[PDB]
Write a protein that binds this ligand. Structure first.
Ligand SMILES: CC(=O)N[C@@H]1[C@@H](O)[C@H](O[C@@H]2O[C@H](CO)[C@@H](O[C@@H]3O[C@H](CO)[C@@H](O[C@@H]4O[C@H](CO)[C@@H](O)[C@H](O)[C@H]4NC(C)=O)[C@H](O)[C@H]3NC(C)=O)[C@H](O)[C@H]2NC(C)=O)[C@@H](CO)O[C@H]1O
Length: 203
């Protein structure tokens, strides 16, 4: 199990100022529904996966300090018709991965058997839902495949999560700085775990 190397102590050291909504036990329990997460490839692939998932989360959530996007749009994309927006509801970032947009809440809701499309606030109000959405995105959108491949691709995870805004950005621009922070956190977490992060890092 990945919990053999990401212990409670490792997690707490990485996220010492987390909002109490987010717990190690919550992550562990939710991860049980994604048995391939953190158990795919070599031990070093498992370590890179955890570092990549949690490094991206560190960026998105501000060290797990935030549940909701700070100072958010309602993130209703009316061109995206498969998952209809609910009147008055807002699809701004929520949970560890800052799940955003009707299309993501809708697809996650369908896959998870949860009322996320009509009640997106569940992601900020139920920590089991919050962790499940982060793992859902990681697995369904195939950040998992990017990082656990030989060779690993951390850059691929950034592209999938927020590539339009963070990849292919001028050096030093806000999106580029966000991207570089993800890389910094990933590499720091890899250092904790004693694993080489690989070379395919930035986008
Ligand atoms: C310089 C620096 O690093 N500053 C930090 C702040 O960036 C940070 O605030 C958080 O910032 C991130 C951007 O890095 C922001 O991320 C939002 O994340 C969601 C989820 O990934 C994105 O949604 C994606 O949208 C695309 C389409 O554009 C979809 O294709 C994709 O499916 C979506 N992904 C998911 C998982 O749903 C948003 O696009 C993205 N927003 C922007 C503007 O880039 C977070 O919401 C910010 N977090 C908070 C809590 O507000 C801040 C955190 O405290 O810390 C600074 O240091």
């Amino acid at each position: 199990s990945w919990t053999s190397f990401v212990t409670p102590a490792v997690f707490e050291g990485w996220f010492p100022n987390r909002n109490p909504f987010y717990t190690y036990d919550g992550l562990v329990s939710a991860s049980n529904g994604y048995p391939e997460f953190g158990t795919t490839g070599s031990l070093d692939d498992q370590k890179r996966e955890l570092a990549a998932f949690l490094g991206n989360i560190n960026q998105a959530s501000g060290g797990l300090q935030f549940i909701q996007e700070q100072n958010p749009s309602d993130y209703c994309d009316t061109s995206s018709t498969q998952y209809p927006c609910a009147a008055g509801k807002q699809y701004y970032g929520r949970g560890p991965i800052q799940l955003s947009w009707n299309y993501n809440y809708g697809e996650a809701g369908a896959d998870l058997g949860l009322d996320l499309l009509n009640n997106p606030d569940l992601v900020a109000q139920d920590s089991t839902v919050a962790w499940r959405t982060a793992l859902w995105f990681w697995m369904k959108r195939d950040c998992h495949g990017a990082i656990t491949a030989s060779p690993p691709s951390f850059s691929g995870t950034i592209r999938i999560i927020n590539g339009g805004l963070e990849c292919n950005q001028p050096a030093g621009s806000i999106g580029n700085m966000q991207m570089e922070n993800r890389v910094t956190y990933y590499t720091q977490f890899c250092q904790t775990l004693g694993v080489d992060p690989g070379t395919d890092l930035r986008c």
